[PDB]
Design a binder for this molecule. Structure first.
Ligand SMILES: [Cu+2]
Length: 59
């Protein structure tokens, strides 16, 4: 297994870093992997974002 690159965004809400980190972590965990790194997408408002791209790696 290699690591997998994934991209998630929302068109209905802007959310903080913490929400997107949470989404990325839980997504990797559902896929039996660990989140290694992530970057926010589509900055919104003064401190929010509309998505995240991230890399899930084997346990
Ligand atoms: Cu974080």
């Amino acid at each position: 297994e290699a690591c997998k690159f994934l991209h998630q965004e929302r068109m209905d809400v802007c959310e903080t870093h913490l929400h997107w980190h949470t989404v990325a972590k839980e997504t990797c965990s559902e896929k039996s992997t660990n989140l290694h790194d992530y970057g926010m997408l589509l900055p919104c408002g003064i401190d929010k974002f509309r998505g995240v791209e991230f890399v899930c790696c084997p346990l």
